[PDB]
Design a protein around this ligand. Structure first.
Ligand SMILES: *C(=C)C1=C(C)C(Cc2[nH]c(Cc3[nH]c(CC4=NC(=O)[C@H](C)[C@H]4C=C)c(C)c3CCC(=O)O)c(CCC(=O)O)c2C)=NC1=O
Lengths: 132, 132
């Protein structure tokens, strides 16, 4: 399913958007501590990486609202290109970050919603995976 | 976290997106019929489809703001998308939002209309800043 279902899920991912970005950031840094190590070490560069993580979640919930994966093809691609060019973020790092966001988001949902939700995450991963 | 009022407006705009986007399109063509005439920027089926696509995505950005209780989704997704749209390369952009505003507001009582109207206005403002 319903337009109520989409809104139900979107309001969940909005309300808990900080719990998700936090969870997903810890999962990322436990799994890949070389990002948080001296070799996202700086507070300004770690802030941008967190800013960019929250942005991907926003983009997902939007696509969930719209029932549509076209925004990923439109503004998603623009932003992922702008990341590795200007900010030098590696493709494996972004792909893994979105896997961590996926996991954390889905933990709040039930199996009916999570099945409806999971492909939106996967679509961004697939749309990046072709590069590296 | 999300108010009961804003969930309901968000569900109402989402459930009637077709009608709203239909009504916003014909109001735009009524007021500016040159746009879908042989010369104009919405004549060709591609360009008219992209206008239809984008209009609907703006209505979902409004819905998303309502759920956020915040203009954050416009800050996060709106501004970046606006910039890129005009880079592709224009007062029709802003007038289509105004018809979308009035098409949307027409579904709502005065209490709900006053909660939603600012988000349209933020998007009209954000657009105006790309004037030559
Ligand atoms: C009618 C007054 C009308 C027209 C003709 C258009 C739009 C339009 N937009 C593009 C490209 C384009 N639009 C956006 C917006 C956008 N992307 C998102 O993901 C957001 C959810 C949404 C904002 C609400 C973007 C980012 C882009 C660039 C990428 C792309 O979609 O191609 C075009 C032509 C593009 C080209 O190929 O040159 C046109 C004609 N909107 C109207 O209201």
């Amino acid at each position: 399913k319903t337009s109520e279902q989409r809104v139900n899920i979107a309001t969940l991912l909005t309300e808990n958007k900080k719990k998700i970005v936090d969870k997903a950031s810890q999962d990322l840094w436990r799994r890949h501590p070389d990002l948080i190590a001296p070799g996202a070490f700086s507070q300004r560069d770690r802030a941008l990486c967190l800013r960019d993580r929250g942005w991907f979640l926003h983009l997902i919930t939007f696509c969930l609202l719209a029932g549509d994966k076209g925004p990923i093809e439109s503004i998603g691609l623009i932003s992922i290109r702008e990341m590795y060019n200007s900010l030098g973020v590696p493709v494996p790092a972004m792909m893994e970050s979105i896997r961590c966001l996926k996991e954390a988001s889905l933990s709040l949902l039930d199996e009916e919603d999570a099945n409806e939700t999971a492909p939106y995450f996967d679509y961004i991963i697939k749309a990046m995976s072709h590069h590296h």
